[PDB]
């Protein structure tokens, strides 16, 4: 067998953050990496949480496969996970949508343009409309 064996080193329970954090030690044999999803699934039945409340990061294999060292948090509630997790991780998991935002540069430009006018732009537009006769 490939074993796929999971291990949870250093279990720190946070009543502050309502989650159990730990260093996942994972045994590969004859398999390159492990994929986060699978790990989450495995944890979800080990700790009773459901893939959503489990959050695993970190890994990177040691050498010649064999071992991988991650960081798993397991949240007491899924709602809690949603409201304590940084959003990128949630997006990765699939829980939350990627925030549909424009380029940084564009945003900055927009801000600068806004700065160059006082208050609302409706008035300015109206003025421009009258300046067509000029």
């Amino acid at each position: 067998s490939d074993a796929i064996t999971i291990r949870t080193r250093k279990v720190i329970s946070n009543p502050l953050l309502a989650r159990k954090q730990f260093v996942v030690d994972v045994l590969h044999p004859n398999r390159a990496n492990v994929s986060k999803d699978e790990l989450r699934e495995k944890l979800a039945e080990a700790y009773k949480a459901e893939k959503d409340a489990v959050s695993v990061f970190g890994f990177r294999t040691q050498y010649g496969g064999g071992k991988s060292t991650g960081f798993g948090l397991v949240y007491n509630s899924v709602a809690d996970a949603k409201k304590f997790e940084p959003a990128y991780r949630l997006v990765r998991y699939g829980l939350a949508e990627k925030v549909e935002k424009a380029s940084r540069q564009q945003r900055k430009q927009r801000k600068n343009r806004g700065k160059k006018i006082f208050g609302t732009g409706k008035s300015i537009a109206k003025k421009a409309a009258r300046r067509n006769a000029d």
Binding site: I12, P15, L16, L17, F71, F84
Partner: protein
């Protein structure tokens, strides 16, 4: 120049933080508070780099903002609020009450304390003065300023503060042959008894202090915080109990206590 410094590069950072040389251009500068920048300990450092209750700044902020962390009765929502020496850090969830009291090496220790003891802050006295409406008041080196102290409380004396209200329960006078804790410089984190105080005109009062191990050390009076009578300190002291060992002894302890 040009106005108060806001930042603190992660180096110029005080070494007793036990911060990392890497992971960030900056350290957290503690805000103003009850303690001196160089000899405080901001909460971002505490709830992360010691207890490992958090894992990054955002997490720490989140923890703070739920308003469960409490420093000395009051809540605190500030990330960098200076929790210095003698600060009682109570967390309602966990029930893990701490009192920030130094290790023998210098660095602040995770001193985990009972909900009965973690109630009173012992506090050194900086000043005895007379304010407005002719009222005498005491200043604690450890931040606070108490209205109306007992006439037999003087300077450089330690004081049991209620913390439940913020008055004086009891006090220890500065006397030779009274248990004392060191809060400054090289001898920082040692405990002992005091043998002599040199009266010294102007240039700092010095204390020759024997510990329990009959090994003298001498420090400045500003660096020394009284802790109780011989046998009875009012505070529970850390593992090591402020005696401090020579390097060899420490090494021996390390390589003898191998229990897998």
């Amino acid at each position: 120049a040009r106005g108060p410094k806001k930042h603190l590069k992660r180096l110029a950072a005080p070494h007793h933080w036990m911060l990392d040389k890497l992971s960030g251009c900056y350290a957290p500068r503690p805000s103003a508070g009850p303690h001196k920048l160089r000899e405080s300990l901001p909460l971002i450092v505490f709830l992360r780099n010691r207890l490992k209750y958090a894992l990054n700044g955002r997490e720490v902020k989140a923890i703070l903002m739920q308003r469960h962390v409490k420093v000395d009765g009051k809540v605190r929502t500030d990330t960098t609020f200076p929790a210095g020496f003698m600060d009682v850090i109570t967390l309602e969830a966990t029930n893990e009450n701490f009192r920030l009291v130094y290790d023998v090496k210098g660095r602040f220790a995770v001193h985990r304390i009972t909900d009965e003891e973690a109630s009173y802050k012992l506090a050194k006295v900086k000043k005895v003065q007379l304010g407005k409406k002719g009222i005498p008041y005491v200043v604690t080196h450890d931040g606070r300023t108490i209205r109306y102290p007992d006439p037999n409380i003087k300077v450089n004396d330690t004081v049991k503060v209620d913390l439940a209200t913020g008055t004086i329960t009891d006090f220890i006078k500065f006397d030779t042959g009274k248990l004392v804790y060191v809060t400054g410089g090289r001898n920082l984190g040692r405990v002992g008894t005091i043998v002599h105080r040199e009266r010294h005109e102007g240039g700092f009062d010095l204390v020759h202090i024997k510990d329990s191990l009959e090994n003298t050390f001498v420090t400045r009076l500003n660096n020394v915080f009284v802790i109780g009578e011989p046998g009875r300190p009012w505070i529970s002291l850390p593992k090591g109990k402020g005696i401090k060992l020579t390097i060899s002894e420490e090494r021996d302890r390390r390589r003898a206590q191998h229990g897998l």
